[PDB]
Design a protein around this ligand. Structure first.
Ligand SMILES: O=C(O)c1cc(S)ccc1[N+](=O)[O-]
Ligand SMILES: O=C(O)c1cc(S)ccc1[N+](=O)[O-]
Ligand SMILES: O=C(O)c1cc(S)ccc1[N+](=O)[O-]
Ligand SMILES: O=C(O)c1cc(S)ccc1[N+](=O)[O-]
Lengths: 171, 171, 171, 171
């Protein structure tokens, strides 16, 4: 034989190991519209109707947003908007309520409960009405047979929703 | 009631969904030593003995490197170095061979096979010998009862090793 | 050379592949006690206080139940019971309500909301009062720094609770 | 109010929690054929050619076997058999060797190395030749763009192969 000494400069004692990391996908939507009927005297919602253009999804990452619109997700060609229709607002107190409504995603419809938390009624300095408020709730992808190709392992069956709203009087 | 129009500027139609992402952890070690005996006439390794200071792990992320040394991983206090001892080199041809040796990690020892691929023998311009070569192989964390607290789900049971070596003659 | 024909009887063309399966752990508790104060005239809970002996966990699998009591879970030696204390019952209607209370698990306490669904008030055939009802709600393991060693990947951060109750008048 | 005592007989203090379990899928194939040329004087394989009918997969579970043949896996209609063609057998010693060959799965072909371990040459009691032997090796699903729809998380990128063979002389 013959003996050698490492050249530490061009020698790697090296390893790869595969691990998982769980992480949240957060996204809003740039383009959506709503009808909001709300009686500040009794702090009750009367009519809440939301249409969201799927096209305008924003999960801060373009190559995913595009992918969201494909058959294995939204089908934005066939089903271009998702919609929410309030069917009932059960008041808890002036700050809180239980809003039941119809969610439709890719033409499939389920009744869901959202937690209304009134961020605060006011009559803005200009003399016209404003309100803050938020709607919170969990929906199951499985309930809307959504992204059915994707396993409940890779991506959560649970979607959490937070609709933050400022909103001003009409005409 | 009363009617409101969204203020799109301070309104988020928002969602969070939890998903997993598989990813490789790659790390070398800054401080290690080796005894390398190799006969270029027959391209056979004769003795290969490596000691790696666990302390010097580098997975390009300090807060993980530190964590690697704790009880649930390396135990670098109790077991400060991991070691490899060649017990056999079965030659395939001048470029390839099957190196069997003893790996010890945190005082637990298993015989492992590495795939020797000679990157190339030479007599460097200065008239002294050099060799390139690499050792490749998979080891199982479970085989060395390693990081036993961490599930084989979160972090792979499989560790892949690639030892890249340049090495020059002695004295 | 020489030619051979397989003996299909003692020949396996064989493969192993590792895959994940998500699955629910369902468990009750054999031993627990409660104080239940409820006014059938207004269908409001007045006081709801539950103590559950951790010891009596039953996830239909003994070797897991035992393991539940160890440091990396319940610590049943140090913290032998988990407890729920009602702090507020906000009535929705006669069938539904929002119960807020203090949950304590291994000595850590958080206020949680449960969804009360009255399964039905009655005056049983014997002339004494009975009530059915259920409490539903999600709690986060992370909120109670629970099983902190176990990753939110292996085991869900979310625990779902369903307390089904039949209950009869006192004395 | 009024006070109630639980009826422990019809009361569940109950919980669901979602967890993952990693597990091996093991399967053979019922129907396959091979050409085996092997020189017991030098214990070298000369020609090894295997064709496996995908149709005959057996992972001890019919509803999965069927599913294996669909577009998101084998495409057994379009690509009814997978095949292995030996291109080289590098002998280690009389018990061991490194077999390089072409694997084709759903019409995609990669060269793979299998570890030949001769279970034992003999001349059986009837005066004719027999041999035992096994071929072991890992292949990557990704290398054969296989089940590409299924994430490397749900199902391992790594497939392990063990071909166990008894085999008798021809004519
Ligand atoms: O990608 C690489 O070349 C590689 C790098 C390191 S540090 C360890 C193992 C490897 N493997 O397994 O190939
Ligand atoms: O972290 C938040 O405040 C949040 C943000 C968005 S965009 C959606 C849901 C949320 N939830 O569930 O809270
Ligand atoms: O456990 C076994 O012996 C084994 C069995 C089969 S069918 C395939 C691969 C294997 N490996 O990888 O060892
Ligand atoms: O499936 C059920 O009815 C259920 C059962 C138990 S023991 C706990 C929670 C549950 N949830 O969340 O519904």
């Amino acid at each position: 034989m013959k003996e050698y000494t490492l050249d530490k400069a061009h020698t790697d004692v090296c390893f790869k190991i595969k691990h998982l990391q769980i992480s949240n996908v957060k996204g809003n939507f740039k383009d959506y519209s709503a009808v909001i009927d709300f009686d500040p005297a009794s702090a009750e919602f009367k009519k809440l109707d939301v249409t969201i253009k799927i096209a305008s999804v924003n999960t801060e990452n373009q190559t995913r947003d595009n992918h969201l619109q494909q058959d294995d997700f939204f089908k934005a060609k066939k089903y271009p908007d998702m919609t929410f229709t309030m069917k009932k607002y059960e008041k808890i107190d002036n700050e809180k309520g239980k809003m039941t409504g119809t969610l439709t995603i890719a033409g499939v419809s389920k009744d869901i409960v959202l937690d209304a938390e009134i961020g605060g009624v006011a009559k803005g300095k200009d003399g016209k009405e404003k309100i803050g408020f938020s709607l919170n709730g969990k929906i199951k992808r499985s309930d809307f047979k959504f992204a059915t190709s994707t396993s409940t392992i890779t991506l959560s069956d649970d979607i959490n929703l937070n609709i933050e709203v400022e909103a001003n009087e009409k005409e």
